[PDB]
Amino acid sequence: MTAAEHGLHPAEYPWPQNGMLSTFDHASLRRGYQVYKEVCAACHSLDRIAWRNLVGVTHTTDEAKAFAEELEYDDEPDDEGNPRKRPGKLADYIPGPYPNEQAARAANQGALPPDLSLIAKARHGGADYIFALLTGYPDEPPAGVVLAPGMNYNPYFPGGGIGMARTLFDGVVEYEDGTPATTSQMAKDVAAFLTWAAEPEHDERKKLGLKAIIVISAMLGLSVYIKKFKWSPIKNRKFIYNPP
Amino acid sequence: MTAAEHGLHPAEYPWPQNGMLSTFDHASLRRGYQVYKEVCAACHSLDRIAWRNLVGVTHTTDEAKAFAEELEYDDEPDDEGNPRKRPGKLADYIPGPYPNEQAARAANQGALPPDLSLIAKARHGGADYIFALLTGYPDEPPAGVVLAPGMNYNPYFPGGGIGMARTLFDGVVEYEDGTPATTSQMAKDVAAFLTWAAEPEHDERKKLGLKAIIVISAMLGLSVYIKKFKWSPIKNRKFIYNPP
Amino acid sequence: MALRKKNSLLNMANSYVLDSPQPSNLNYFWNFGSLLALCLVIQLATGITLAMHYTSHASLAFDSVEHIMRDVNFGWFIRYAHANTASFFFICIYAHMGRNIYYGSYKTPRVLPWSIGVIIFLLLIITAFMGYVLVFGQMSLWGATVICNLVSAIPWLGEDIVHFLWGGFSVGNPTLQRFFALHYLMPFVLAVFALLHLIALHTAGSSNPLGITSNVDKLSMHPYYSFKDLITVFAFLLMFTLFVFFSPDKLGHPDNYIPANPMVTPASIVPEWYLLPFYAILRAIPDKLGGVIAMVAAILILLILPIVDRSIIRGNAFKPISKLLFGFFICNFLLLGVLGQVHIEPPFIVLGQICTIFYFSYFLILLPMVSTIENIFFYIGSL
Amino acid sequence: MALRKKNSLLNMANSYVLDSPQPSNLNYFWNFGSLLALCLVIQLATGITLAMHYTSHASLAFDSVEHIMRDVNFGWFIRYAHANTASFFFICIYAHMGRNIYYGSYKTPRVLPWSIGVIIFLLLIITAFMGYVLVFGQMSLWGATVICNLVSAIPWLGEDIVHFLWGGFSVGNPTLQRFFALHYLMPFVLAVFALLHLIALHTAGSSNPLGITSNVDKLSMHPYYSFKDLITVFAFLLMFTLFVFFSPDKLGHPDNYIPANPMVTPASIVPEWYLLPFYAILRAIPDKLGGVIAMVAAILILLILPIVDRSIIRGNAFKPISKLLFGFFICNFLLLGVLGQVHIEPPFIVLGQICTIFYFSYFLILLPMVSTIENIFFYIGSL
Amino acid sequence: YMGWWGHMGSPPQKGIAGYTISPFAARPFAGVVHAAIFNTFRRTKNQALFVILPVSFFYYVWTQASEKNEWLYTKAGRHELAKAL
Amino acid sequence: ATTFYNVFVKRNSAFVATILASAFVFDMTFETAIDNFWDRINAGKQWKDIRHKY
């Protein structure tokens, strides 16, 4: 296949979480949630994430309850069996922008914006692909490229023509921690956030892995000593043969 | 427990399907569907039965398609993602009178009319219980019985006080086959129909059982001959002992 | 040398099903072992097939069983075969255990097959209990609730253990999904233990109804017991046919056709019939923990028969007093079963306590006394 | 007599794990058998646990796997352990088979353990294929579609068989639910065959790297090989740890994190890496039925090694030409693997055909020729 | 305690001659009517007490208990029920 | 009897072939016989008996 059909391969960026012993940067995760909420969430759902999931990762219990309580969710029917709404709770999932696929496609010139909860695992490249894609819209398509109507040129996307236009521009978000919201900064934060959404066990997993590595290595060393100890009578055996 | 707490035990009526070799009477099944549709279906669903299930049991393909096509069912959303309705198809399930339990209870003074698809298997007595209950509302409760509000006396129902009033009266239905629609006749037909709804494999099962009984019995007889044949040298063995 | 003897794999089969030396006088009560193997094979075949159509999620479980009954080709048969064979499995296992107790199969040198047998019986109970929950009807839920709450009686940790078993704070979806996985597994464990008790038996061989050695007079397992097993196989299949095709719900509870409802409690919650004697024993002790201990002890006490039977003779064929005591023990076991499903009302409360005492006193008092006296009567009576 | 020898049950364990007489010179390639047993135990433990949380219904399957990853305590670990151990199982099985081929373990008198071994390998492939479908992501669906459509090639009845396997007209809910039931069962069948090949081996004992008898010099299995097995167990656990904790998705396909969509076809539908050489063999033959036959023959041809190896000597340790041929055969097998996942484009189409010819010509031409000539060189060379 | 064919673990046997005839030479159902009637009658008569006595006793116990329980939950049994609880 | 034995019984290959062919015949004839008997004992009751009205 041509390189265009594959898509350009994203650079390997030095993410804070790259590194056997490295967690996510939680300040970046929190900023990335704010980019998601103010930019991506207009078209993209995050359906696998509940409000409780933010708590003690990016937000306190109170902040997350406040986010949940601002929304309305379907309650159980009332006593006459009529539909009712209730305010959100921490157990609720973050609600998506569209009621169904048909509505999503209608709002996006036929294209369906994927749910972003697993996107960092569902694409080769992970965070690097998300960062490269969001920051990789050239001002002008390479001469000779014919885009289908409603497509935008992006070399990272396979085939080059993506239905999502560029959305991150300097200062579309005002971060609450005073960080300059440049295109690059926002793409980095949201790519970190989405990586966390895909693999929220990441930090715990790598710490447990460190404990396992240490114990298993020591056991490997001791198992070598013990095997050699037990085998030495066999290895050291000597023979004298006197032919009968 | 008191007999009242148990409920009076229904008589054993001689149903056509009683009998190892007996099917349902399908003319009674068809009449019973008509009682269901014109009387019971106001309060009771039959959610496990699809229109296709009636075909070749009680109705032809065309009659059942006509019943389905008169109703509206939820379709997939249109292209703007707005809700749509479609006409019914044979694959559709027979729709219930109420959208939820709360609406069902609101319409029946708090009582919830059960779905009738398994009722003949879900009560001791089966068809006999349904027939006895429907035909067993005395004009006056036995002296001394205090009914709770919205309850009706019926001795077959455990405790005596049932939230369902008598519904079958001579000529509430006009059968399409000219049968006199008395209380007893309608109760018999609907009890047959509900028994079919609970166990629609009934007729096929009992015929397959007849084949199995015949084959297995012959195999049992032959296995006796063969065992005796093979064992006769052991059974017939004789000894002469001459002590050494 | 014949291939069946020379090749090590064939020779293993040969040793168990063909050249296996059997007593020449086994009666029809030695046929329950092969019926139990048949039930196990039917349960595996029907069970794996139901697993192809069943959904273990609590929102779909009960409906997936209706879909099996209504839509799957022959689903009604596979479902009823599986449900009724579970009852037949217990009839055959009670017959097999009663054979073992009457003929002294638990005595030396067969203590090990008997003891592994007691564990097989416990695994069958657990397997059947978990399978019954999978329907997720009213009896499924409420039986799981009552039986799993007995674990709360374990001191100190009981409550914690219950929540851990349920995977939550009541019987619900997590419990159903775990019961499905374990119900699928447990029959494979049960098959391994069934094989273990046969390998353990193979050192002494089968006992026989006279209680004497059969080393003087052996018959090959095939063709004699192969063809004798076919008679009871076809008798079993005739009983199976009558229930599965003509009365498929005779052995069941109508309330299990109502979907599980954690709010409404059914009129009476009883276990399946085959667990009823143990349930009566539990009711007899007023204390919760006492009752659980008694109920478990009623099964584990089978492990002491090798000790408390003091007879110098194996089995009851020639022991008139032991035969009478055995008759009373068996009938009492059936009465306990009946009392397991009556209401907790007079006069069944006291009767259940007397029957429970009789059950335990068989092992602890009567069998040791009667077997001691009969030893002396044989000796004095034949002088 | 010691209890471990006297008691029949203990003596069976004793014969396989303790007193079992082993050659004193087994090298580290004799450790893959115990690693395979370890993989099997991990897959049973993790698999049964995932079954407690997984839902086989197509509307819930993919989400039940997300629930395992996100909500179940340590669910991420159990899921990644199960997924990565499936790959480790195939690395160990290829190593075990390569050991067997290099050292002549298929030669008399070990034809029977080798032949049952070939069936174990087929059952592992089926087990792993069905388990991969259970995720119900894009690769799950589309891999099931293309692999199950190969059955359509069976003449006359092929289409009917496919619809029968699917339980409908395409891969859907019925197929997923039946794959769950069979995926749960197949590992138990695989464990039985693994036991059968060991019992078959026990008649000759283990071969050894020199290819000579070890009857002159035996060592007990315990403690020597018990402690030598611990070294590779801990080496395996270190590799396991690096994948499961530090790179859990390295061996997977990102498309399996997209829910199955029968409309959209993924860019490239490839099997899991361990099936890739067989897929390359299938692509090499242009005919559909031809390709399926070739692919199956590529596994079944292992059954003829006992015949086509004409050597008077067991194994390759002393055979320089056989060692070179074996090296080329193994590397060709890896190249076929790589070609299984390239696009069907020049020049890989022809290269795949040449590698397929080389694969088959090893069994049919080269090994019979080389083993014939080496027999003559040993004889003439040592005169 | 059990050997195998050729060394089963029997004490030495001597002096017994055993005779039998081919299954094809015999009538498998010889004497079946006599057996079915007289042999079954003898075998059943000799075991009858060991079944009848416990069955009849436990059935009587049940019958008395079930009849009392039924009576206690009638109007007539009100007072006796009140005492029993 | 000798002839019958010699052709159909003596060789097990022939005996098994005869048994399987008979099983095929039995299966097809028994099906038809039961179907007719079932229809006679349940006459007027089955859908096929009332179908003509509709």
Ligand code: HEC
């Ligand atoms: C108003 C529309 C819109 C906004 C705003 C938007 N997207 Fe998208 N996005 C889409 C559409 C439409 C697609 C589908 C494009 C296609 O498949 O052609 C898409 C696709 C994607 C993809 C997948 C591309 C692929 O490989 O399939 C990722 C990742 C993505 N968006 C992330 C984001 C992030 C991160 C943001 C903002 C911070 C964002 N999107 C903002 C409309 C939007």
Ligand code: HEC
């Ligand atoms: C307008 C209301 C209404 C109509 C009409 C009606 N039912 Fe009911 N039915 C109920 C209610 C309410 C209950 C629940 C009563 C209770 O549990 O107290 C009920 C209960 C039942 C029960 C179960 C009683 C039990 O054992 O739990 C059966 C069977 C039944 N109905 C059948 C029928 C049949 C058959 C018809 C008509 C041919 C019918 N019903 C007509 C309202 C109705």
Ligand code: HEM
């Ligand atoms: C000893 C073997 C077994 C016993 C005693 C047993 C017992 C039972 C019982 C009592 C039920 C409840 C039946 C009902 O009322 O509907 C049941 C259900 C079930 N069993 Fe088993 N079972 C066994 C083996 C198996 C096996 C091996 C499987 C393989 C998965 C299995 C799968 C099921 C399934 C899916 C259900 C639920 C569907 C249904 O109720 O029919 N069973 N089992």
Ligand code: HEM
């Ligand atoms: C899955 C359940 C079981 C199967 C398939 C099974 C199978 C068998 C078989 C085939 C035999 C040899 C033939 C026979 O005597 O009937 C046997 C013997 C025996 N079984 Fe079981 N059995 C099972 C459960 C049990 C249980 C629960 C016990 C004990 C509590 C038990 C104890 C014995 C004993 C003691 C023997 C030896 C009896 C003798 O021959 O004297 N078995 N079993």
Ligand code: HEM
């Ligand atoms: C030889 C043993 C086994 C092998 C090679 C094996 C292989 C696999 C594979 C490759 C998958 C796909 C994993 C993924 O990518 O997510 C899988 C999934 C699964 N396996 Fe197994 N498996 C084995 C044994 C078992 C057993 C015994 C069970 C018991 C039920 C089981 C239950 C499951 C379940 C529920 C899943 C789906 C959830 C998931 O994807 O993790 N497996 N298996």
Ligand code: HEM
């Ligand atoms: C679940 C998969 C398997 C397990 C658990 C397993 C286990 C074992 C074990 C423990 C041994 C003895 C120790 C050793 O030599 O490594 C062994 C030997 C053997 N296995 Fe396997 N095995 C499996 C699959 C296979 C396969 C797929 C084959 C063949 C295609 C095979 C063929 C053999 C042979 C021929 C031997 C004897 C080798 C010798 O000692 O010379 N096995 N296996």
